[PDB]
Structure formats: C-alpha cells, structure tokens
Amino acid sequence: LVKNKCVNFNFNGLTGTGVLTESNKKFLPFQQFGRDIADTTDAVRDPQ
C-alpha cells in the first residue's frame, strides 16, 4: 500500500485515480466505504 502520490487506486475491487493522504471520518465502526455530496468515494478503509 502506497500513499501521498497519484496511483490508479484499486481498493476492495473498486478503483479510480487520485492522491490519497490520510483520514479522519472515523466510519461508524461497522462502516466501510466513504462518500461525499456527489459521493465520489471520499474515503476508503485500506483493508489490507
């Protein structure tokens, strides 16, 4: 797992490209995949 640089991120099968820095949202513990206004995958829990 690599961070802080553009990769074609492919997490849990789901994909996309961007620069992945950190996280703060603290999914309601059960929760897995984050979303925003356009839902646009605004987070992911690296599940490695």
Partner: peptide, 28 residues
C-alpha cells in the same frame, strides 16, 4: 461586504471552475 456573504473545491473536483475576476475588489 460583511453583510452579503455565502464544498467549493469539492465541486471543483468534477470539472467545475470559478475563474477569478479581472477587477479585484481593492481596484473597484
């Protein structure tokens, strides 16, 4: 100014763009 007041970079991340004015306030 203070009365009339209002994400932005988020919708930017969809193709949005808000070009800045040529006449900034101070000049106006």
């Amino acid at each position: 100014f203070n009365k009339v007041t209002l994400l932005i970079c988020a919708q930017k991340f969809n193709g949005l763009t808000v070009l800045p004015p040529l006449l900034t306030d101070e000049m106006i």
